[PDB]
Amino acid sequence: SFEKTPAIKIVGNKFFDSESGEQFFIKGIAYQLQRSGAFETSYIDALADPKICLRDIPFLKMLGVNTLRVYAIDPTKSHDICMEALSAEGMYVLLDLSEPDISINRENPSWDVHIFERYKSVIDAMSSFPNLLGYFAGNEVTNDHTNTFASPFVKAAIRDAKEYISHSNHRKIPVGYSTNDDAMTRDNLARYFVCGDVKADFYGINMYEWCGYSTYGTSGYRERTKEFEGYPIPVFFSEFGCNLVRPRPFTEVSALYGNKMSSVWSGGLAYMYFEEENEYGVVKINDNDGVDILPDFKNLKKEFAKADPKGITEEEYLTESVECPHIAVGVWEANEKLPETPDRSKCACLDEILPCEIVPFGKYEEYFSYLCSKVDCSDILANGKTGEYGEFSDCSVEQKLSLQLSKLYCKIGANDRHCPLNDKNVYFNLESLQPC
Ligand SMILES: OC[C@H]1O[C@@H](O[C@@H]2[C@@H](O)[C@H](O[C@@H]3[C@@H](O)[C@H](O[C@@H]4[C@@H](O)[C@H](O[C@@H]5[C@@H](O)[C@H](O)O[C@H](CO)[C@H]5O)O[C@H](CO)[C@H]4O)O[C@H](CO)[C@H]3O)O[C@H](CO)[C@H]2O)[C@H](O)[C@@H](O)[C@@H]1O
């Protein structure tokens, strides 16, 4: 049963309970374990392990959260027990689609079949749950003025995730973006993610402006609120909880759910449940695998308990694209033109027909240098600054390398099955001889 968590839907720039019509405000906390290699996932999926989630849910209930943010799940594992247990306590999940080893690389961005398949797998693993609030298609990808060209790749991912969900049988779970709070890029990022023909469904900010005993005015929350007034999609703090002063009083929570902010913001999620020697936890897991409550826990509990956002109902709420920011060198370099939807079938042709391949089974960046000095690699280049994307730029890194390897082989024309790269991961594809 999911009775206690009816699906949340979006209308304009607010979330609503699809059954009651009441505005939904997030009172959340980030919930993600980390390991302190070839045999286990690099990330830990607490939602795949009942003994973990069932341990923590009583404590989450005590905090008074209705939402968790989870950054990584393993789509090969079941999640129904933990998701059902969360639902039974009125709790929803915001979930990143990426994981540390499969994400858009902010410094060398690509939007390709490998990352897209990761996104689809998470969508197919998690979309049956009514308490799946939303998916993030990226987290802090562009994070300063030096990597703004990564943002078109994120927007393509938003487009493609939304279309994959739309064409599937699943409930249309919204797909949004989570950003940091760099003063130089934050305005352009917010506009970019709602400009042109592709838009984020919602927008979360990792918000650390309020440290210690700050105020609505001095913290910055007042100005942030003024600037998001009328922003066309729901906006919330995907993280908050600056730890400069401890124990964190979390007085920002009083502001966030107060009358002035509640008209603009859809709430927020504290960062985070687990203590990881980074002093951001509200609990610490002991050597006995038990939960030790930390000094922050009671302050967050008290502040959420007191939080009573006055919203508006769906019915009362109910009663021309935005221009993309202009390009300026060193300042804003995210082209409006987006990479194409990765095409698994086109890219799989490379696996079948290419004479020379590199298996997925330091090397890569060096092998590109070498190959791309001998053949023209334009067809695998992706440029988010100029909006120019090569024909095979959506294929996996290994497919892109294999294409260049095979072009070099054909250019040489020895036709002797010696792939022109002496390396254990290189092989001559025998299927290439079979007569996309
Ligand atoms: O320099 C050349 C070498 O570059 C390497 O590539 C680097 C590349 O791997 C790296 O990718 C970034 C991802 O790792 C990153 O993944 C995100 C996680 O960081 C995030 O963690 C969250 C954290 O943000 C929050 O504060 O706490 C959470 C709870 O603890 C924690 O989970 O989770 C996200 C969701 O799972 C996850 O996506 O994502 C970035 C943005 O998309 C990626 O950029 O990027 C580096 C550049 O910044 C690259 O250097 C190559 O692999 C090597 O071959 C090269 O030698």
Ligand SMILES: OC[C@H]1O[C@@H](O[C@@H]2[C@@H](O)[C@H](O[C@@H]3[C@@H](O)[C@H](O[C@@H]4[C@@H](O)[C@H](O[C@@H]5[C@@H](O)[C@H](O)O[C@H](CO)[C@H]5O)O[C@H](CO)[C@H]4O)O[C@H](CO)[C@H]3O)O[C@H](CO)[C@H]2O)[C@H](O)[C@@H](O)[C@@H]1O
């Ligand atoms: O470093 C990697 C992590 O980067 C994050 O993104 C960064 C982003 O969060 C950051 O935002 C700026 C805020 O930090 C800044 O906040 C200011 C407060 O820190 C300050 O606290 C005062 C304190 O200075 C004083 O000493 O004592 C006071 C009493 O205790 C205390 O309140 O208050 C200021 C207001 O008076 C407040 O401004 O505000 C800036 C302007 O809004 C924010 O931009 O900016 C960084 C770049 O500059 C970002 O890199 C990511 O989210 C993390 O995931 C990364 O790990």
